[PDB]
């Protein structure tokens, strides 16, 4: 086109569509082409262009071929939200080269940057932003768990927890917290670097929380029980395969 004019939102919907339909290559190229085609100055792009892209890129590698006990963005600075000055403005084709996992992670760091961009007036980030920061950290964790950077994965799951814990009570929130709490443990079982004693405390904590949630008779009991069974077995492993 003479100079193609981009509706970001529409491009985002189309990319979500492509992703939902397992057309991962085609989704990634869409975000890529959209991002390379936006004006290079004065505009902050839609964060979803980066997340969808990450998910698409990440899914291609898959389908083809210190304890932050209480991280809290409420009373602590998130050192991992980079300045928008460091956002990529062109050359998004590079995210097809080399380590696709790394590329997806870097794309998500950019989503984190736009979502976590502090306001000018001292108003904190809205619920929607912090949930979305949470969701992003979950996705980083998943990629890292899949790339076998398990320690890096734990760090992000914990961070996701922190963010999720800042949201006003609601059933979505609870589900996210529990998911997070579980994912910490799912990653922790792979980490030799953490003492067996520090592992048991974490597992028991997630165990209790899962059992507490069960007495509430939730809609996803079945999935919640699967989670519980895994943590229980992981407790028995470190209990049996240590001291005996």
């Amino acid at each position: 086109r003479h100079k193609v004019q981009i509706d970001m939102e529409r491009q985002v919907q189309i990319a979500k569509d492509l992703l939902a339909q397992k057309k991962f290559l085609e989704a990634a190229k869409r975000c890529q082409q959209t991002l390379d085609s936006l004006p290079k100055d004065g505009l902050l792009p839609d964060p979803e262009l980066f997340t969808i892209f990450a998910q698409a890129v990440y899914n291609m590698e898959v389908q083809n071929s210190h304890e932050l006990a209480n991280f809290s963005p409420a009373n602590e600075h998130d050192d991992e939200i980079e300045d928008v000055s460091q956002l990529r403005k062109s050359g998004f084709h590079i995210y097809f080269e080399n380590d696709l996992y790394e590329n997806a992670l870097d794309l998500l760091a950019q989503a984190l940057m736009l979502l976590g961009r502090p306001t000018a007036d001292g108003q904190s980030l809205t619920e929607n932003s912090r949930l979305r920061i949470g969701d992003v950290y979950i996705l980083m964790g998943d990629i890292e768990r899949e790339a076998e950077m398990f320690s890096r994965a734990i760090h992000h799951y914990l961070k996701a927890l922190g963010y999720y814990k800042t949201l006003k009570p609601a059933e979505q929130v609870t589900e996210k917290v529990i998911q997070a709490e579980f994912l910490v443990c799912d990653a922790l079982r792979w980490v030799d670097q953490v003492p067996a004693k520090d592992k048991l405390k974490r597992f028991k904590h997630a165990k209790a929380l899962l059992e507490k949630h069960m007495t509430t008779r939730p809609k996803d009991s079945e999935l919640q029980q699967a989670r519980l069974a895994q943590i229980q077995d992981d407790i028995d492993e470190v209990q049996e395969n240590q001291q005996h």
Partner: protein
């Protein structure tokens, strides 16, 4: 009559998309899968009776996996089982 052979083939293409496999090697693999099946199902059966349960659940398959699979194979195995059950139940 090989239950898993066509599925094995699909798993292979998800792993090495440019690699093939003989019908014979799928046959040996099918036999492996059938064996692991039988061992797990039979251990899970024993566990079921022991706990006085008349249902075999994901619980007793998970326990059976840990007895029958060697150390790390089991560790990934229970992780993979948890995730399928996790996804399926959603």
């Amino acid at each position: 009559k090989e239950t898993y052979s066509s599925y094995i083939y699909k798993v292979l293409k998800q792993t090495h998309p440019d690699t093939g496999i003989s019908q014979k090697s799928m046959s040996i693999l099918n036999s492996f899968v059938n064996d692991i099946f039988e061992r797990i199902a039979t251990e899970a059966s024993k566990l079921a009776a022991y706990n006085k349960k008349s249902t075999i659940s994901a619980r007793e398959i998970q326990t059976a996996v840990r007895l029958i699979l060697p150390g790390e194979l089991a560790k990934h195995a229970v992780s993979e089982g948890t995730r399928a059950v996790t996804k399926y139940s959603s």
